[PDB]
Design a protein around this ligand. Structure first.
Ligand code: CHL
Ligand code: CHL
Ligand code: CHL
Ligand code: CLA
Ligand code: CLA
Ligand code: CLA
Ligand SMILES: CCCCCCCCCCCCCCCCCC(=O)OC[C@H](CO[C@@H]1O[C@H](CO)[C@H](O)[C@H](O)[C@H]1O)OC(=O)CCCCCCCCCCCCCCCCC
Ligand SMILES: CCCCCCCCCCCCCCCC(=O)OC[C@H](CO[C@@H]1O[C@H](CS(=O)(=O)O)[C@@H](O)[C@H](O)[C@H]1O)OC(=O)CCCCCCCCCCCCCCC
Ligand SMILES: CC1=C[C@H](O)CC(C)(C)[C@H]1/C=C/C(C)=C/C=C/C(C)=C/C=C/C=C(C)/C=C/C=C(C)/C=C/C1=C(C)C[C@H](O)CC1(C)C
Ligand SMILES: CC1=C[C@H](O)CC(C)(C)[C@H]1/C=C/C(C)=C/C=C/C(C)=C/C=C/C=C(C)/C=C/C=C(C)/C=C/C1=C(C)C[C@H](O)CC1(C)C
Ligand SMILES: CC1=C[C@H](O)CC(C)(C)[C@H]1/C=C/C(C)=C\C=C\C(C)=C\C=C\C=C(C)\C=C\C=C(C)\C=C\C1=C(C)C[C@H](O)CC1(C)C
Lengths: 222, 217, 214, 50, 236
């Protein structure tokens, strides 16, 4: 279903002659989509595979992250004031009060932009450095892309049979995240509304409130 | 999952006592012959043909009883009577029955002509269905294929098996829902698209219990 | 023939005799050297890129012609290519040649549904064969796609392949011109040419656009 | 309208051979048959025109 | 590439019905042969010869003629007779020439009706009367009175059709070639010629049905080709 010659492919019934040789089904989510042929070199394929997975995991966090504040404040705590619409949430650190988590002044109450900058650079720098190094104090399992040695406390992946299917589940949920993250970006720029607000407009008038309603709002007027 | 002994059953977990003759050899076999109506293998075969035909007709009926109304509701067209249980009277109007509301379409003005044409056309193709005719010869009475599968979606045997279940399941759902269309028309007296809109507007008061209900008595 | 082999022309003309990628040997049409970035160093990537070029080209040639006709017809109101899609939202929707009754499309959802279904089959058939042809060359199928049997002589086919890619490459570059000119001028490509023909020195890119671009 | 049908009937009667049974029944090989039918047609027209 | 993915590559002879048999007289060699002849108009006709009725008034008894024999005349034989070149009316090759000539006229007519309606704005039916009263083309008034054009049309088409009838080879009557195939697209016996001829009958049959649509729509709606199209759209 997801490995071997009979695996599921991107073009479905017409994917028979679109499968690049080097793509054989030995890696998760190998639907055989390399029309341009960037993964012709095995080393470049190795690097691209890691980049895709890293992007997917970041996108998966981004998707949930970009919706949790707005969804909560739309019906719930309601503390997030105007910093709930992701794109327009960065200036939360520029609020006289401060970037208070869950709109709670006691929580974080950060106010220094340079501070969070340096902190993240140090926190992310070391972690990304360990990831590039291929070794660290934590268990590394030997696999940089899959260091479940310590990053897998629940041991949800103790047998290889599950790990395989689980790897496919990870990337496929990740791909949908990457695809949807690209959606958040474009919808933000084109509409200037939060992702749920765009969803609300579609539900109200699906025909009228679609992507083509804002098609002419980029026309290059003389 | 949908074939063989280790298949799914209509009674979920507590469905161990399934009839012997229902042993996962046909699409949609959930072991629901509680009345033993299909103990006879010959009667079971005929009932299977009856189920598929009733289902295929219902699927057309379900879609056809919504489109004329759904397009009218959205303002796409001006039908004579978009509601399915009043569309028949369109033939008695001054302008007859105009397809899509366009006078330059079918523009029928005679119910006798409609009936006579239907008897001859339905009579021939139904005879073709059971005996074979211009479209092809009969091999499987309910799964002819060939001319009736031009896209070749059932070319793969395994896919057809799976797709066979998909047809009867969408068909069975249509039969139930179309049965609902009949009852809701008799009770609500309003088209199913209208009835749906009402409930969705106020699912608390625009429900069958809040209205009608006791009225049926 | 002159377009194939080592004697083949080169993109730098005289200053390319000592500047030719080893992998480029003149065995494919439109081989003017170049490839200064080594993108097609991998033989597999070269084959994939070569197909994308001919595809992108055959599209650009359709696009280049298609972006001009509607702007060169009084019936279509000389509509600009970048301002044609909005016509679907017009009162009369899309009327081919500006003649009432033609198509009369008014729903952009219906057009996208038909385009997605029809183009998905067409592109799929181009990938793993189909009713038109099976086992034919990916970029040069022939048969149903060569009804007039123009390219039946291997020699003529070779020369015509160069003719296709060169007209196509010009169309690709000109289409990129159409894209940018539209974003800068804001008017149709034919309108731009008319202006440059009227007052060439007065109506150019630098006379009324370069300064406002920063 | 009679002219249009007269042309089309002339085309038919120019292409399709008479039936064998009708040819013998009406004696189509005998020109006196044409005289009998023409006399019949001309007195039909005389009654109408009167 | 293969395929067999989005289509069912069933093997058979494309006929006008999903399952049926070609008539014995419809082999399938001719372009566009779909085994369509339910009335058997191209079936080789059988005729009986009756003897000459006795009409001698010098004889005591004048018995009418009787069947002198049954003969099946050979069809598709062109002769030097200008008025009746073919041996039999009901021949496959004569009908194919009729099908092609009727079809080629319809192709010009179907395009001609559309173009003049989109150029002049006048219905093709109303076009006939307008040109009759004021000879004109593309809005330009022609320099010839209608009386001369009437004679010229009959004389020009008379010569043109008399030239056409000179040909004796039945296949060349349907496909003259020569000056009428300057590009030599389908002058050889290749498969491309067969495919091109298959395209021609399809476009020809389409145009024959299409122009039959024009006349009936003009009879019923009262509008022309483009006009009927506009009427239908507004009808909604
Ligand atoms: C990592 C991805 C990332 C993305 C896609 C965005 C996207 C965005 N940020 Mg943002 N940010 C991101 C990371 C970060 N931001 C901030 C801190 C802020 C602030 C303080 C603000 C934004 C703002 C914005 C929006 C305006 C453009 C912008 O980036 O402003 C400037 C920021 C950059 C040019 C760099 C940001 C990182 C990356 C290169 C994205 C570009 C925009 C939609 C603005 C906004 O809309 O606030 C309401 C704004 O004021 N971001 C931090 C903390 C250090 C980030 C750390 O990774
Ligand atoms: C030595 C310290 C060290 C620290 C503090 C971190 C910290 C982190 N690593 Mg990490 N890593 C570290 C070492 C290493 N990593 C990796 C390989 C990876 C990968 C492949 C990924 C991370 C990711 C992450 C982040 C999320 C992981 C997570 O939640 O896991 C526990 C699981 C659930 C809570 C996180 C901030 C993830 C990331 O950044 O994605 C956003 C990620 O995908 N690391 C290797 C192997 C070379 C390491 C070797 O030392
Ligand atoms: C290559 C395909 C393609 C391209 C380049 C465009 C381009 C455009 N469409 Mg469009 N469309 C295309 C396909 C399709 N459109 C539509 C339906 C519509 C509608 C309904 C509308 C448009 C409109 C527009 C214009 C947006 C307003 C404007 O002037 O912005 C300025 C933009 C530019 C000057 C050019 C921007 C393009 C950039 C240079 C890159 C071009 C290549 C891209 C990779 C695009 C790839 C497309 C596919 C493969 C994903 C714009 C020029 C709008 C319009 O014309 O209103 C005035 C509009 O209302 N399109 C359909 C479905 C029927 C398409 C199907 O393929
Ligand atoms: C790419 C991943 C990502 C990123 C970059 C962010 C970034 C941010 N989130 Mg966030 N979040 C994410 C994923 C992410 N989130 C996910 C997956 C969830 C679902 C659990 C949440 C749920 C969440 C909530 C409920 C809140 C934020 C908030 C915030 C903002 C202030 C918190 C902060 O950064 O200080 C550091 C954060 C901590 C030290 C908390 C530690 C983790 C514990 C929960 C900040 C811009 C706060 C906000 O006001 O939004 C603007 C807020 O209250 N997020
Ligand atoms: C068993 C299925 C079924 C049945 C019995 C009917 C019956 C009917 N439909 Mg209908 N329809 C169906 C399925 C069905 N439909 C489906 C699946 C769709 C979705 C595509 C539609 C969409 C539809 C529309 C949009 C309209 C109807 C209309 C009608 C009525 C006009 C009858 C007519 O003139 O036929 C039409 C004659 C032909 C189509 C020529 C036949 C040529 C072959 C069948 C092709 C009629 C009572 C019209 C109506 O009266 O609205 C209330 C109307 O405009 N139907
Ligand atoms: C990939 C290339 C490409 C693409 C994406 C487009 C896309 C588009 N073209 Mg275009 N075009 C192209 C290439 C392309 N074209 C080329 C190469 C040419 C030169 C032949 C043209 C010439 C052209 C014209 C003249 C027009 C368009 C128009 C359009 C727009 C609407 C298309 C339509 O009406 O529906 C689809 C079209 C068809 C399905 C063709 C069917 C034609 C009908 C059925 C019959 C033709 C009319 C007939 C001759 C009229 C009869 C009477 C007459 C003889 C007087 C659309 C955005 C129209 C427009 O209004 O722009 C906004 C328009 O008028 N194109
Ligand atoms: C309206 C329909 C009009 C039909 C007009 C044509 C009728 C047939 C004309 C030729 C008659 C003929 O066969 O030979 C003339 C007929 C038959 O002559 C021969 O007779 C032989 C036996 O001697 C055999 O029966 C032969 O079959 C028969 O051809 O001669 C007679 O039967 C004498 C009386 C004829 C009276 C007229 C008969 C036709 C009247 C009505 C026909 C109705 C339906 C026909 C179908
Ligand atoms: C958008 C669609 C538009 C469609 C419009 C429809 C009408 C268009 C106008 C008519 C076009 C046809 C022109 C005539 C072709 C032809 O057969 O003659 C040209 C051929 C020459 O090739 C000769 O041809 C002879 C036969 S044939 O023509 O090859 O069949 C051959 O035997 C001989 O060897 C060879 O020399 O000559 C003949 O067939 C003999 C007659 C010569 C006299 C020609 C008439 C004078 C010119 C008239 C021009 C009218 C325009
Ligand atoms: C299995 C079992 C077993 C055990 O043992 C016992 C028991 C339980 C008994 C069993 C069960 C059974 C069942 C359930 C049954 C059901 C049935 C149905 C409901 C059907 C429907 C059925 C239904 C159907 C067909 C439907 C149809 C419809 C149609 C055609 C339609 C038509 C139309 C249209 C479109 C529209 C218009 O306007 C009108 C009209 C014209 C009218
Ligand atoms: C060789 C080399 C080598 C080294 O190594 C590196 C380097 C340098 C990088 C390289 C280079 C490259 C290049 C130059 C590229 C370019 C490209 C392009 C521009 C394309 C286009 C491309 C383009 C294209 C396709 C286009 C297309 C178009 C189209 C379809 C159109 C459509 C349309 C029409 C008709 C009209 C309407 O109204 C609108 C529309 C709808 C819109
Ligand atoms: C096919 C293949 C092969 C051939 O050969 C060629 C080609 C074509 C090249 C290829 C393709 C590819 C594709 C298709 C695609 C890509 C995509 C993407 C979109 C990614 C993303 C990706 C994406 C991503 C990562 C994203 C991420 C995001 C994030 C983290 C976010 C964050 C945040 C939050 C939470 C919230 C706040 O308020 C803000 C922030 C702080 C900002």
């Amino acid at each position: 279903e997801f490995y071997g010659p009979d695996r599921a492919k991107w073009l479905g019934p017409f994917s028979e002659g679109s499968v690049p040789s080097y793509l054989k089904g030995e890696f998760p989510g190998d639907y055989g989509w390399d029309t341009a042929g960037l993964s012709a070199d095995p080393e470049t394929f190795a690097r691209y595979r890691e980049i895709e997975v890293i992007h997917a995991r970041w996108a998966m966090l981004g998707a949930l992250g970009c919706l949790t504040p707005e969804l909560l404040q739309n019906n719930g705590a309601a503390d997030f004031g105007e910093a709930a619409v992701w794109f327009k949430a960065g200036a939360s650190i520029f609020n006289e009060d401060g970037l208070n988590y869950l709109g709670n002044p006691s929580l974080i109450h950060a106010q220094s932009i340079v501070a969070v900058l340096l902190t993240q650079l140090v926190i992310m720098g070391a972690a990304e450095a360990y990831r590039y190094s291929g070794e660290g104090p934590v268990e590394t399992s030997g696999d940089s892309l899959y260091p479940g040695g310590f990053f897998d406390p629940l041991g949800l992946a103790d047998d290889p049979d599950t790990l395989a299917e689980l790897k496919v589940k990870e990337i496929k949920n990740g791909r949908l995240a990457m695809f949807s993250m690209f959606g958040f970006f474009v919808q933000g720029l084109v509409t200037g509304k939060s992702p749920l607000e765009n969803l609300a407009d579609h539900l109200a008038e699906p025909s009228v409130n679609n992507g083509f309603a804002s098609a002419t709002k980029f026309l290059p007027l003389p | 999952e949908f074939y063989g002994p280790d298949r799914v059953k209509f009674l979920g977990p507590f469905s161990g006592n399934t009839p012997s003759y229902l042993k996962g050899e046909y699409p949609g076999d959930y072991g629901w012959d509680t009345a033993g109506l299909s103990a006879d293998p010959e009667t079971f075969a005929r009932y299977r043909e009856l189920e598929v035909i009733h289902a295929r007709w219902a699927m057309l009926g379900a879609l056809g009883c919504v489109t004329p109304e759904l397009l009218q509701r959205n303002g796409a067209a001006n039908f004579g009577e978009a509601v399915w249980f009043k569309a028949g009277a369109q033939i008695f109007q001054e302008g007859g029955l105009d397809y899509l509301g366009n006078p330059n379409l079918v523009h029928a003005q005679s119910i006798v002509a409609i009936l006579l044409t239907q008897v001859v056309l339905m009579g021939l193709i139904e005879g073709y269905r059971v005996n074979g005719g211009p479209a092809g010869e009969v091999v499987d009475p309910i799964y002819p294929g060939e001319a009736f599968d031009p896209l070749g979606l059932a070319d793969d045997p395994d896919t057809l098996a799976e797709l066979k279940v998909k047809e009867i399941k969408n068909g069975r759902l249509a039969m139930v829902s179309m049965f609902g269309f009949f009852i809701q028309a008799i009770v609500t007296g309003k088209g199913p698209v209208q009835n749906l809109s009402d409930h969705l507007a106020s699912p608390s008061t625009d429900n069958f219990y809040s209205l009608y209900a006791k009225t049926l008595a | 023939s002159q377009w194939y082999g080592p004697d083949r022309p080169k993109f730098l003309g005289p200053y390319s005799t000592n500047f030719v990628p080893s992998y480029l040997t003149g065995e494919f049409p439109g081989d003017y050297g170049w490839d200064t970035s080594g993108l097609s160093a991998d033989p597999a990537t070269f084959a994939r890129y070569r197909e994308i070029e001919v595809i992108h080209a055959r599209w650009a040639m359709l696009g280049a012609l298609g972006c001009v006709v509607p702007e060169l017809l009084d019936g279509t109101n000389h509509i600009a290519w970048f301002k044609a899609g909005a016509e679907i939202f017009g009162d009369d929707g899309i009327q081919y040649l500006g003649i009432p009754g033609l198509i009369n499309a008014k729903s952009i959802v219906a057009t996208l549904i038909v385009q997605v279904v029809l183009m998905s089959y067409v592109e799929g058939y181009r990938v793993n064969g189909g009713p038109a042809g099976t086992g034919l060359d990916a970029v040069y199928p022939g048969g149903n796609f060569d009804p007039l049997g123009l390219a039946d002589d291997p020699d003529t086919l070779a020369e015509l392949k160069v003719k296709e890619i060169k007209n196509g490459r010009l169309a690709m570059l000109s289409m990129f011109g159409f894209f940018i000119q539209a974003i800068v001028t804001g008017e149709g490509p034919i309108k731009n040419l008319n202006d440059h023909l009227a007052d060439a020195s007065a109506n150019n890119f630098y006379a009324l656009y370069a300064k406002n671009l920063a | 309208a009679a002219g249009i049908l007269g042309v089309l009937a002339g085309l038919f009667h120019l292409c399709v051979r008479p039936p064998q049974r009708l040819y013998n029944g009406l004696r189509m090989g005998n020109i006196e048959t044409v005289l009998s039918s023409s006399i019949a047609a001309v007195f039909w027209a005389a009654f109408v025109v009167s | 590439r293969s395929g067999g993915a989005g289509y069912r590559q069933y093997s058979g002879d494309a006929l006008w019905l999903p399952n049926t048999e070609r008539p014995a007289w419809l082999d399938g060699s001719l372009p566009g042969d779909r085994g369509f002849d339910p009335l058997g108009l191209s079936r080789p006709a059988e005729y009986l010869q009756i003897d000459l009725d006795e009409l001698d008034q010098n004889a005591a008894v004048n018995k009418a003629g009787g069947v002198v024999g049954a003969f099946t005349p050979v069809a598709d034989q062109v002769s030097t007779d200008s008025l009746a070149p073919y041996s039999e009316v009901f021949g496959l090759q004569r009908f194919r020439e009729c099908e092609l000539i009727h079809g080629r006229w319809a192709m010009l007519a179907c395009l001609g009706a559309l173009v003049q309606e989109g150029v002049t704005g006048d219905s093709w039916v109303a076009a006939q009367t307008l040109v009759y009263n004021q000879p004109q083309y593309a809005g330009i008034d022609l320099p010839f009175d209608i009386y001369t054009l009437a004679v010229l049309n009959s004389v020009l088409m008379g010569g043109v059709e008399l030239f056409r009838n000179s040909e004796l080879d039945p296949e060349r009557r349907c496909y003259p070639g020569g000056a009428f195939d300057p590009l030599n697209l389908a002058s050889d016996d290749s498969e491309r010629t067969q495919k091109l001829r298959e395209a021609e009958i399809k476009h020809a049959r389409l145009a024959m049905v299409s122009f039959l649509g024009y006349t009936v729509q003009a009879w019923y709606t009262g509008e022309g080709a483009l006009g009927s199209l506009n009427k239908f759209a507004n009808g909604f």
